[PDB]
């Protein structure tokens, strides 16, 4: 199975997922001087007041916090988007060291981690159908830097002991993802892909300019998770990020000057 190790990592993925070498792969480096301000970009509309979180799962590559997406409860609209995108899950990518972990980079700078809030276009009915469309998903990407603690992240950190290994899940109701956002909703946007297999080219990426800060203890607890299942040799879940891919025939637009 694909992974992040030397023998099954990002360099290998193209052999089973040839779209790895495609025209709109993610993540990418965001060159801030080359991105263009687009005054026609609308403000993001993040409407999470009615979010219903259900469960947290170690899926062997990261942990997902899952939401009830059977109604318009937590949705993303506006910005570059046409229509309404429902929150289905969020997850993170992170490093073994504070100087790496993010998937997107900014002027080649790597953050300690990156949060992905994953949404699907309600005109396609369900997530499985959405990922087969060029405008199927909207992923909101938020950089994490190490500094002061993020209070709204702590309930996530404290449950990770109960989902240490692959396939473990825990009830995770009443979590408010609004606590994970920075102050500003200024963003960059570009057309891209899932950053894990199957690497489908179905994502409108919206990457916030302002990182959130998390504490060293918070990200240390991420690093104590396991890629492996219970009773298997322990492999710490670290460096579960794909490096920047060629931008090719794309331009990154900015919502701000
Ligand atoms: N030397 C043996 C290594 C074992 C792993 O083999 C793999 C070979 C390829 C993949 S892929 N194309 O899904 O990333 C995953 C695992
Ligand atoms: N067709 C099944 C798809 C399963 C994977 O779902 C993903 C959903 C989001 C991402 S990412 N890192 O681009 O936000 C990766 C994978
Ligand atoms: Zn992701």
- Bridge partners for 77 per DSSP: 45
- 195 annotated to bind ligand: yes
Report the distance separating Cα 60 and Cα 72, nearest Å. 29
How would you class 12 by CB atoms within 10 Å of its CB: exposed for 0-12, middle for 13-18, buried for 19 or more? middle
Cα angle for residues 129, 135, 138 (degrees, 5° grid): 95
Complete DSSP assignment for 104-145: SEETTBPPSEEEEEEEEEGGGSSHHHHTTSTTSEEEEEEEEE
Catalytic residue numbers?
61
Q: Name residues with Cβ closer than 5 Å to ligand 3, which is an ion.
A: 116
Residue 1, annotated as binding a ligand: no
Q: What structural domains does the chain harbor?
A: 1-257 (3.10.200.10)
Number of H helices, E strands in the chain: 3, 15
Q: Is 116 near ligand 2, meaning CB less than 6 Å away?
A: yes
CA angle 117, 123, 129 (to 5 degrees): 70
Burial class (CB in 10 A: 0-12, 13-18, 19+), 184: exposed
Instruction: Indicate the DSSP class of residue 27.
Output: -
**118 Cβ closer than 6 Å to some ligand 2 atom:** yes
Residue 90's DSSP bridge partners are 65, 117
Contacts of residue 231, defined as CB under 8 A and 6 or more positions apart, other chains included, come to: none
What per-residue string of b and e applies to 79-91 under the rule 16 or more CB within 10 Å gives b?
Answer: bbbeebbbbbbbb
Documented resolution in Å: 1.6
Distance 92 CA to ligand 3 centre (A): 6
Say if residues 114 and 241 touch (Cβ distance below 8 Å): yes
Q: Considering only CA atoms, which residue is closest to atom 8 of ligand 1?
A: 8
Which residue is it, tokens 């219970």?
Answer: 230
Q: Report the alpha-carbon distance of residue 253 to residue 189 in Å, rounded.
A: 5
Please provide residue 113's backbone torsions phi and psi, each rounded to the nearest 5 degrees.
-165, 170
Note whether 49 and 125 are within 8 A (CB): no
Tell me, using a 6 A CB cutoff, whether residue 196 lines ligand 2: yes
Question: Residue 164 burial (CB < 10 Å; 0-12/13-18/19+)?
Answer: middle
160's tokens? 């990770």
Phi, psi of 251 (to 5 degrees): -125, 135
Mutate to test the pocket of ligand 1, among 2, 14, 21 (most ligand atoms within 8 A of CB): 2
CB 195 near ligand 2, within 6 Å:
yes
Token digits of residue 254 = 């900015």
- Measured by CA distance, the residue closest to atom 1 of ligand 2 is 128
Distance, CA of 5 to CA of 250 (rounded, Å):
29
Q: Which residues pair with 203 in a beta bridge?
A: 137, 192
Instruction: Give the three-class secondary structure for 60.
Output: coil
| Ligand 1 nearest atom to the CA of residue 9, by list position | 14
CA-CA distance, 107 to 88, in Å (whole number)? 30
Residue 93 annotated as part of some ligand binding site: yes
* 105-120 burial code (b ≥16 CB/10 A, e <16): bbeeebbbbbbbbbbb
Sign of CA pseudo-dihedral 226, 227, 233, 234: negative
CA distance 188 to 196: 21
Whether the CB of 15 sits within 6 Å of ligand 1: yes
**Method by which this entry was solved:** X-ray
Give the residue whose CA is nearest to atom 1 of ligand 1: 7
Mark out the alpha helices in the chain (DSSP H runs). Answer: 127-130, 154-159, 216-222
Residue 2: CB within 6 Å of ligand 1? yes
d(CA 25, CA 254): 19
Rounded distance from Cα 4 to ligand 1 centre (Å): 10
Ligand nearest to the CA of 5: 1
CA dist 9 and 257 (Å) reads: 37
Strand spans (E) along 184-238:
187-192, 203-208, 212-214
**CB of 110 closer than 8 Å to CB of 100:** yes
Return the C-alpha torsion angle 105, 113, 206, 36, nearest 10.
Answer: -20
d(CA 255, CA 80): 9
Please give the Cα distance from 116 to 64 (Å, whole number): 10
Angle at 164 between CA 160 and CA 167, to 5 degrees: 110
Asked if 58 and 166 count as a contact pair (C-beta separation under 8 A), the reply is yes
* Distance from the Cα of residue 97 to its chain's centroid: 19
């Amino acid at each position: 199975h694909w992974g992040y190790g030397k023998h099954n990592g990002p360099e290998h993925w193209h052999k089973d997922f040839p779209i790895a070498k495609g025209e709109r792969q993610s993540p990418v480096d965001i060159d801030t001087h080359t991105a263009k301000y687009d005054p026609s970009l609308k403000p993001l509309s993040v409407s999470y007041d009615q979010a219903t979180s259900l469960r947290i799962l170690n899926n062997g590559h990261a942990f997902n916090v899952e939401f009830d997406d059977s109604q318009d409860k937590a949705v993303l609209k506006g910005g570059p988007l046409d229509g309404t995108y429902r929150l289905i899950q969020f997850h993170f990518h992170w490093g073994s060291l504070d100087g790496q972990g993010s998937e997107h980079t900014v002027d080649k700078k790597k953050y300690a981690a990156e949060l992905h809030l994953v949404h699907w276009n309600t005109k396609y009915g369900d997530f499985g159908k959405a990922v087969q469309q060029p405008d199927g998903l909207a992923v909101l990407g938020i950089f994490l830097k190490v500094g002061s603690a993020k209070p709204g992240l702590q309930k996530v950190v404290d449950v990770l002991d109960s989902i240490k290994t692959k396939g473990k899940s825990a009830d995770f109701t009443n979590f408010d993802p609004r606590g994970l956002l920075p102050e500003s909703l200024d963003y960059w946007t570009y057309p891209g892909s899932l950053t894990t297999p199957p690497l489908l080219e179905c994502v409108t990426w919206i990457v916030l300019k302002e990182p959130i800060s998390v504490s060293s203890e918070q990200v240390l607890k991420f690093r104590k998770l396991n890629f492996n299942g219970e009773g298997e040799p322990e492999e710490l879940m670290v460096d579960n990020w794909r490096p920047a891919q060629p931008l090719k025939n794309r331009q990154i637009k900015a919502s701000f000057k």
